[PDB]
Design a protein around this ligand. Structure first.
Ligand code: 9YZ
Length: 288
């Protein structure tokens, strides 16, 4: 009872999440109960030191009884809510640019420490009313796995999953997080998810109908992926110009690099921060 419940924030991947108050310090936190493997201990331990202004701070890790409780900094809204609330008008392009720039800085930090997110999605991007955005749950996938359904049976979304994961490669490189952020960038710009698949094969075929069915020219090695089938239909690639209007040419070039099929060709977070799309980046104050 170090922490008093204030209210239920929601249902997470791994257990319930409460906004809570630290009895001694007076601080308000998001307290996640994780529903314990030595993988999970040593991973979580690394994560308490992986601190950066665009990563939601892991304040503490309590391991008591059967359970693991992670205590995080509290932020008041997620990007999924902010996008739904911005549906009529869209998030303004300078704010989209500022958020992408801040998220790439969070990714560049984590990846320089060899830690991946692996399940980036709008629900895991948290914003404050000052203009910042931060990545939540970084590292939890390697600690705990990414399940097919959550503890309350909700389906974990596939919409932001990289194609190498969907084709059954079990080696995750930092490129998986660049793909997910590219999908979120496209969703902020057009106000619709880019590849809203509802099964692994629907997700792959939505990817292939936009970017073309991958072959050994664009992705050497693809036909040796565990789940690759020579019988996948062959779709032609569309132009980006049709996929994310009214994004300008620099943003379309950057998106295209974040969505290359071969993880080895996909742009890194450090290289993305240098892209001319960010020449004019600013830090606007958002409408909440
Ligand atoms: C899933 C393991 C892996 O890293 N692969 C799959 C095979 N592959 C490759 O070149 O095999 C001849 C490949 C190519 C690009 C990215 C990942 C992988």
């Amino acid at each position: 009872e170090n922490f008093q419940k204030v209210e239920k924030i929601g249902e997470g991947t791994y257990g319930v999440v409460y906004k809570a108050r630290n009895k001694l310090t007076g601080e308000v936190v998001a307290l996640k109960k994780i529903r314990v493997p030595s993988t999970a201990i040593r991973e979580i331990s690394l994560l308490k030191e992986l601190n950066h202004p665009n990563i939601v701070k892991l304040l503490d890790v309590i391991h008591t009884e059967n359970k693991l409780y992670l205590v995080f900094e509290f932020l008041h809204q997620d990007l999924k809510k902010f996008m739904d609330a911005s549906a009529l008008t869209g998030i303004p392009l300078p704010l989209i640019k500022s958020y992408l720039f801040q998220l790439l800085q969070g990714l560049a930090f984590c990846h320089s420490h060899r830690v991946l997110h692996r399940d980036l999605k709008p629900q895991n991007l948290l914003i404050n009313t000052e203009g910042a955005i931060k990545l939540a749950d970084f590292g939890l996938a390697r600690a705990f796995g990414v399940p097919v359904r959550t503890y309350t049976h909700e389906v974990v979304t596939l919409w932001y999953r990289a194609p190498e994961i969907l084709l059954g490669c079990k080696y995750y490189s930092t490129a998986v997080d660049i793909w997910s952020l590219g999908c979120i960038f496209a969703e902020m710009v057009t106000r619709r998810a880019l590849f809203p698949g509802d099964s692994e094969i629907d997700q792959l075929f939505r990817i292939f109908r936009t970017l073309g069915t991958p072959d050994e020219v664009v992705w050497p090695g693809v036909t040796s992926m565990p789940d690759y089938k020579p019988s996948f239909p062959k779709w032609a690639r569309q132009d980006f110009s049709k996929v994310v209007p009214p994004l300008d040419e620099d943003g379309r070039s950057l998106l295209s690099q974040m969505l290359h099929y071969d993880p080895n060709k996909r742009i890194s977070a450090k290289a993305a921060l240098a892209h001319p799309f960010f020449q004019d980046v600013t830090k606007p104050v958002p409408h909440l």
